[PDB]
Amino acid sequence: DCAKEGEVCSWGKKCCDLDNFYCPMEFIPHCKKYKPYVPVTT
């Protein structure tokens, strides 16, 4: 079992593909697809 795209991650579950998806930092994070290659300060 895993959290698909748009599914609650972190406290909820672990995103099926953490490599292609990331878990946001909020009250109820949702699996979101991303592909960064040039991270910047923030």
Curated annotation (Swiss-Prot):
It is found in: Secreted. The record marks 11, 27 as: Interacts with TRPV1 (reaches into the void formed by S4, S6 and pore-helix). Coiled coil: none annotated. Keywords: Disulfide bond, Ion channel impairing toxin, Knottin, Lipid-binding, Repeat, Secreted, Toxin. Disulfide bonds join 2-16, 9-23, 15-31. Its main location: secreted. One of its GO terms (molecular function) is toxin activity. Interacts with TRPV1 (2 toxins (4 moieties) bind 1 channel (homotetramer)). The presence of 'disulfide through disulfide knots' structurally defines this protein as a knottin. This toxin contains 2 'disulfide through disulfide knots' that are separated by a short linker. Bivalence accounts for irreversible toxin action. Belongs to the neurotoxin 23 family. Double-knot toxin subfamily. This is Tau-theraphotoxin-Hs1a.
